[PDB]
Design an enzyme around this catalytic site. Sequence first.
Site, PDB file in Angstrom:
ATOM      1  N   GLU A  35       0.819  -1.205   0.000  1.00 34.70           N
ATOM      2  CA  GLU A  35       0.000   0.000   0.000  1.00 34.70           C
ATOM      3  C   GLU A  35       0.857   1.261   0.000  1.00 34.70           C
ATOM      4  O   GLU A  35       0.546   2.224  -0.711  1.00 34.70           O
ATOM      5  CB  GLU A  35      -0.933   0.007   1.213  1.00 34.70           C
ATOM      6  CG  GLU A  35      -2.061  -1.015   1.155  1.00 34.70           C
ATOM      7  CD  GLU A  35      -3.130  -0.672   0.130  1.00 34.70           C
ATOM      8  OE1 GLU A  35      -3.126   0.450  -0.425  1.00 34.70           O
ATOM      9  OE2 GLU A  35      -3.979  -1.544  -0.131  1.00 34.70           O
ATOM     10  N   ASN A  46      -7.804   9.313  -5.495  1.00 33.93           N
ATOM     11  CA  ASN A  46      -8.684   8.381  -6.184  1.00 33.93           C
ATOM     12  C   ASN A  46      -9.507   9.127  -7.230  1.00 33.93           C
ATOM     13  O   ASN A  46      -9.662  10.351  -7.181  1.00 33.93           O
ATOM     14  CB  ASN A  46      -9.625   7.685  -5.206  1.00 33.93           C
ATOM     15  CG  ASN A  46      -8.883   6.908  -4.156  1.00 33.93           C
ATOM     16  OD1 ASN A  46      -7.943   6.182  -4.467  1.00 33.93           O
ATOM     17  ND2 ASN A  46      -9.282   7.067  -2.900  1.00 33.93           N
ATOM     18  N   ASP A  48     -12.657   9.343  -7.699  1.00 38.23           N
ATOM     19  CA  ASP A  48     -13.852  10.034  -7.229  1.00 38.23           C
ATOM     20  C   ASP A  48     -13.537  11.292  -6.431  1.00 38.23           C
ATOM     21  O   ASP A  48     -14.467  11.939  -5.935  1.00 38.23           O
ATOM     22  CB  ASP A  48     -14.716   9.082  -6.393  1.00 38.23           C
ATOM     23  CG  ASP A  48     -14.041   8.637  -5.114  1.00 38.23           C
ATOM     24  OD1 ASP A  48     -12.889   9.036  -4.857  1.00 38.23           O
ATOM     25  OD2 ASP A  48     -14.675   7.882  -4.351  1.00 38.23           O
ATOM     26  N   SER A  50     -11.653  11.380  -3.643  1.00 37.14           N
ATOM     27  CA  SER A  50     -11.180  11.038  -2.316  1.00 37.14           C
ATOM     28  C   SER A  50      -9.678  10.785  -2.365  1.00 37.14           C
ATOM     29  O   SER A  50      -9.068  10.700  -3.435  1.00 37.14           O
ATOM     30  CB  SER A  50     -11.924   9.818  -1.780  1.00 37.14           C
ATOM     31  OG  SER A  50     -11.706   8.675  -2.591  1.00 37.14           O
ATOM     32  N   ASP A  52      -6.294   8.627  -0.276  1.00 38.54           N
ATOM     33  CA  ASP A  52      -5.820   7.580   0.625  1.00 38.54           C
ATOM     34  C   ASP A  52      -4.582   8.069   1.378  1.00 38.54           C
ATOM     35  O   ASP A  52      -3.671   8.641   0.768  1.00 38.54           O
ATOM     36  CB  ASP A  52      -5.442   6.302  -0.134  1.00 38.54           C
ATOM     37  CG  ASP A  52      -6.619   5.611  -0.807  1.00 38.54           C
ATOM     38  OD1 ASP A  52      -7.787   5.868  -0.480  1.00 38.54           O
ATOM     39  OD2 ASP A  52      -6.365   4.757  -1.672  1.00 38.54           O
ATOM     40  N   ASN A  59      -8.913   5.611   3.358  1.00 38.88           N
ATOM     41  CA  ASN A  59      -9.622   6.431   2.375  1.00 38.88           C
ATOM     42  C   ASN A  59     -10.516   7.475   3.036  1.00 38.88           C
ATOM     43  O   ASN A  59     -11.317   7.157   3.919  1.00 38.88           O
ATOM     44  CB  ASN A  59     -10.463   5.481   1.506  1.00 38.88           C
ATOM     45  CG  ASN A  59     -10.985   6.114   0.248  1.00 38.88           C
ATOM     46  OD1 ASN A  59     -11.035   7.328   0.124  1.00 38.88           O
ATOM     47  ND2 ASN A  59     -11.401   5.279  -0.698  1.00 38.88           N
TER      48      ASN A  59
END
Length: 129
Positions: A35, A46, A48, A50, A52, A59
């Site tokens: 990750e 991301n 959309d 958002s 991380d 998220n």
Amino acid sequence: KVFGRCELAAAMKRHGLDNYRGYSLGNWVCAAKFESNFNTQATNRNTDGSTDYGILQINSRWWCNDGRTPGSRNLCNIPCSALLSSDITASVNCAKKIVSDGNGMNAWVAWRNRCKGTDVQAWIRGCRL
Ligand SMILES: [Cl-]
Ligand SMILES: [Cl-]
Ligand SMILES: [Cl-]
Ligand SMILES: [Cl-]
Ligand SMILES: [Cl-]
Ligand code: NA
């Protein structure tokens, strides 16, 4: 902070992740490797809108507040910037809520695609724990 592999394993064990909800320590170290490459300061946006955050790439769509993800939730009740600290406490406590929510570690796409079903014990081999 960029953790070493065994350094991170020991810190995750001290914070109660070994066998948490049945997931052995190697699962958590493997997830963090893929990750974030063990880097507490990792961020990724991301599609959309958002973002991380941190060593486990939690998220902002559901788990933390960053002030720039409209309509999102803050289910760990923290600012997302707290997940970037050199102290992994906030990330671990939020991860405990995530893994308890019904889907286990499948919430972490990198865990599902790169750790699940492999010999994850190799990630803690040689470590003084
Ligand atoms: Cl490594
Ligand atoms: Cl393990
Ligand atoms: Cl927001
Ligand atoms: Cl700590
Ligand atoms: Cl599970
Ligand atoms: Na949010």
